[PDB]
């Protein structure tokens, strides 16, 4: 279980503990997954998506049953295998991001470029630049959100946790059905209950019993 981000990442001045990352509460390192929506023309191949998220093109290709050079149709949600590890008391998967345009902000990088796979708060905490001193060509340390199954989750049969970018219309019920797991396992993984509002566009942890399906929309 990890705290649910609960839209606290939408205000860069918000200081809720969840915004600085999942908490290191299990094994120091594990295999994990992110999700990411293909974006044309910059992030729509295994090469460019892996470059943004620090995976490998072969891992992205195999995870989605495509080749490592296959163009991915815009808005397709793909799975991205990554190593999740503990750093500074948090679980995260490191990536590096070079700003392309002077005008990009900590928030635009977290919310738009990385599709809320990281937060403004974690970016600011792990980079030296002032929010008013970012220029094209600056490299950012990007702490992508992932977690490793706790002992209790492992004992329940979950081999991985997957960081799931919730889309319009989706619910814990419908997301659990994609991965063939119980709705209650999804709720428990995020410390939610059936009355909790699950926000669109905010990452949600999904515990997995096996590797994710190659196509999420099936
Ligand atoms: C992902 O990124 C984090 C930082 O966000 C890396 O954490 C780093 O952890 C190492 C290991 O303790 C720290 O190294 C220490 O640093 C000093 C030099 O500053 C040196 O005396 C020693 O080598 C000492 O171990 C390091 O401080 C820390 N980095 C930061 C920026 O705080 C982590 O290793 C990264 N993980 C992966 C898998 O890339
Ligand atoms: C942060 O990102 C989200 C996308 O995850 C943006 O949400 C959009 O909101 C507008 C209305 O303001 C909708 O028309 C779009 O459909 C939403 N996006 C998606 C992908 O569905 C949001 O605008 C971003 N916030 C900022 C301040 O840039
Ligand atoms: C936030 O969490 C950290 C460790 O995850 C802890 O040291 C700190 O006390 C927490 N802060 C609050 C306000 O609960
Ligand atoms: C991969 O794609 C092939 C051909 O489209 C399909 O028959 C096969 O079942 C897929 N494999 C997996 C593991 O999804």
TrEMBL record:
<feature type="glycosylation site" description="N-linked (GlcNAc...) asparagine">
    <location>
        <position position="65"/>
    </location>
</feature>
<feature type="modified residue" description="Pyrrolidone carboxylic acid">
    <location>
        <position position="1"/>
    </location>
</feature>
<feature type="disulfide bond">
    <location>
        <begin position="30"/>
        <end position="148"/>
    </location>
</feature>
<feature type="disulfide bond">
    <location>
        <begin position="24"/>
        <end position="86"/>
    </location>
</feature>
<feature type="glycosylation site" description="N-linked (GlcNAc...) asparagine">
    <location>
        <position position="94"/>
    </location>
</feature>
<feature type="glycosylation site" description="N-linked (GlcNAc...) asparagine">
    <location>
        <position position="17"/>
    </location>
</feature>
<feature type="disulfide bond">
    <location>
        <begin position="12"/>
        <end position="120"/>
    </location>
</feature>
<feature type="disulfide bond">
    <location>
        <begin position="84"/>
        <end position="146"/>
    </location>
</feature>
<feature type="domain" description="LysM">
    <location>
        <begin position="162"/>
        <end position="206"/>
    </location>
</feature>
<protein>
    <submittedName>
        <fullName>LysM type receptor kinase</fullName>
    </submittedName>
</protein>
């Amino acid at each position: 279980q990890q705290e649910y981000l609960n839209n606290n990442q939408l205000d860069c001045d918000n200081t809720h503990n969840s915004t600085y990352g999942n908490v290191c509460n299990s094994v120091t390192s594990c295999q994990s997954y992110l999700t990411f929506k293909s974006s044309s023309p910059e992030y729509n191949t295994p090469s460019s998506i892996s470059y943004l998220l620090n995976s490998t093109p072969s891992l992205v290709a195999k995870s989605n049953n495509i080749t490592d050079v296959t163009p991915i149709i815009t808005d397709t949600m793909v799975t991205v295998p990554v190593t999740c590890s503990c750093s500074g008391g948090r679980y995260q998967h490191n990536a590096t991001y070079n700003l392309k345009k002077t005008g990009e902000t900590y928030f635009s990088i977290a919310n738009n470029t990385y599709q809320s796979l990281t937060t403004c708060q974690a970016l600011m905490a792990q980079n030296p630049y002032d929010a008013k001193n970012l220029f094209a060509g600056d490299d950012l340390h990007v702490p992508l959100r992932c977690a490793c199954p706790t002992k209790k989750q492992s004992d329940a049969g979950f081999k991985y946790l997957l960081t799931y970018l919730v889309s319009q219309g989706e619910s814990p019920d419908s997301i659990a059905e994609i991965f063939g797991v119980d709705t209650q396992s999804v709720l428990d993984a995020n410390e939610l209950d059936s009355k909790s509002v699950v926000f669109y566009f905010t990452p949600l942890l999904v515990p997995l019993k096996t590797e994710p399906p190659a196509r999420l929309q099936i």
